């Protein structure tokens, strides 16, 4: 019954903000060049670029490299989002976040070089195994709660929580990736973005939202991890939004009473009643019965034994990732979108 460990957490978060604000004020630019990396294989694809496995040639270290087509970023209206992503990544520091190692740009593309996590996405493991046990789901949930506590204290909203964006490392721990929709927000923001299944009601209703949408998404994530499917799904997105805003959620019979109670409070359509967004804040989540067995400090310190460790086949193995057809990276003779990506 001691809470001087909250005084220490308060002090921790104060130091974290100091370090963040220094890097936020004086960000890093052009810390590398494309010819220093050996392109090996595509790990993922997107509407305005692709992610590749890469090898830092002088050192031999494997990294992931996100390649963004500047013209396509402009076209798809992701300019501000791309700038947010880089500026936030270079300023943040937390155990369960993927680290940005280098960033640079050329005539055609933007480049972000980051930690490679060969264990792959939680998504693939969840879809294969079917669903996770509640202790297994709780292990991952606890890491996301501490990560959101860290990010939110720096006034950052993540806005893209889902199994696809949670990588599993060699120790079985979470590495949160894809900061594409991350934004620094004191007060409200208005962009309609994220994945339909994971969208909070506020976002759908186009009214203005805050940090609370992250806590909603945590509920969706915990549900999907434990159930094997998300709480709101349908053939098309519009029918998914109807379900989200309705205030109706059905739980599998195997869900414990504690889990159902936590999720009722996280999947609270009224934002003044949603866990994480009340006066006690994140401690409502942390002190909940479902997390009664969670040693929060041991999790942060990575001292808890992981329930699942992915099969290690080397630092450059890509067997946990799907295969994609390989297009050559063409850099134009002329600079594209020089003004739009000036601060990158």
């Amino acid at each position: 019954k001691k809470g001087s460990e909250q005084e220490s957490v308060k002090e921790f978060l104060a130091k974290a903000k100091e370090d963040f604000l220094k890097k936020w004020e004086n960000p890093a630019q052009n810390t590398a060049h494309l010819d220093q990396f050996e392109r090996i294989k595509t790990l993922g694809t997107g509407s305005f670029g692709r992610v590749m496995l890469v090898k830092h040639m002088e050192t031999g270290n494997h990294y992931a490299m996100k390649i963004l087509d500047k013209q396509k970023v402009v076209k798809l209206k992701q300019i501000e989002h791309t700038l947010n992503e880089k500026r936030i990544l270079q300023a943040v520091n937390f155990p369960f976040l993927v680290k940005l190692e280098f960033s640079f740009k050329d005539n055609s593309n933007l480049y972000m070089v980051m930690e490679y996590v060969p264990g792959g996405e939680m998504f693939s493991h969840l879809r294969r195994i079917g669903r996770f046990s509640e202790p297994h789901a709780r292990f991952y949930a606890a890491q996301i709660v501490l990560t959101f506590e860290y990010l939110h204290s720096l006034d950052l909203i993540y806005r893209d929580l889902k199994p696809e964006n949670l990588l599993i490392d060699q120790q079985g721990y979470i590495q949160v990736t894809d900061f594409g929709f991350a934004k620094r927000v004191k007060g409200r923001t208005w962009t309609l973005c994220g994945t339909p299944e994971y969208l909070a009601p506020e976002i759908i209703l186009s009214k203005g939202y805050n940090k609370a949408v992250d806590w909603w998404a945590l509920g969706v994530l915990i549900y999907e991890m434990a159930a094997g499917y998300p709480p709101f799904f349908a053939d098309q997105p519009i029918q998914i939004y109807e379900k989200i805003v309705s205030g109706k959620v059905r739980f599998p019979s195997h869900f414990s009473s504690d889990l159902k109670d936590l999720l009722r409070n996280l999947l609270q359509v009224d934002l003044t009643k949603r866990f994480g967004n009340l006066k006690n804040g994140v401690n409502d989540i942390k002190n909940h019965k479902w997390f009664a067995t969670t040693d929060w400090i041991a999790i942060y310190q990575r001292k808890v034994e992981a329930p699942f460790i992915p099969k290690f086949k080397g630092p450059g193995d890509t067997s946990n990732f799907d295969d994609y057809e390989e297009e050559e990276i063409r850099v134009s003779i002329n600079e594209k979108c020089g003004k739009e990506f000036s601060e990158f």
């Binding site: 997107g46 889902k162 696809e164 594409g180 973005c193 799904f233 053939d235």
Partner: peptide
């Protein structure tokens, strides 16, 4: 069963926002 409905909808694969 709900799980069967989830499989029946072709949205079991990786989902992209954009």
């Amino acid at each position: 069963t709900t799980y069967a409905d989830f499989i029946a909808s072709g949205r079991t694969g990786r989902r992209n926002a954009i």
